[PDB]
């Protein structure tokens, strides 16, 4: 399918144990997509002070359309040194590996895969 319905665990930034997906834009997009498929991907909501506590390159989920069955349609965009790879809408959060942290909420998304 071109899209897949997922419910992402929302994590507090200070709880996150693995603070990024890798060391290049291509690698983080690849690993984010794999973790999304495997159910091992968390979401951190972006506020002041959040991104400096995580590791670049960042992977964002951004809104791609203006929400079937409550799932916001999203796509992935990476960022490294102020340059973004991908073009999309508002940021819903930054993705990180999930390795068992306890979430504060869930964000329902329809991921363009």
Residue numbers in the entry: 11 to 76, 79 to 125
The study reports:
Nonstructural protein 1 (Nsp1) of SARS-CoV-2 is a multifunctional protein with an essential role in viral replication. Nsp1 plays a major role in the shutdown of host-cell mRNA translation, the promotion of viral RNA translation and the suppression of the cellular immune response. Nsp1 is a 180-residue protein which consists of two domains: an ordered N-terminal domain (NTD) spanning residues 1–128 and a C-terminal domain (CTD) that comprises residues 149–180 and which is unstructured in solution.
Initial attempts to generate a crystal system suitable for CFS using an Nsp1NTD expression construct consisting of amino acids 13–127 produced crystals that diffracted to lower than 2.5 Å resolution (data not shown), making them unsuitable for a large screening campaign.
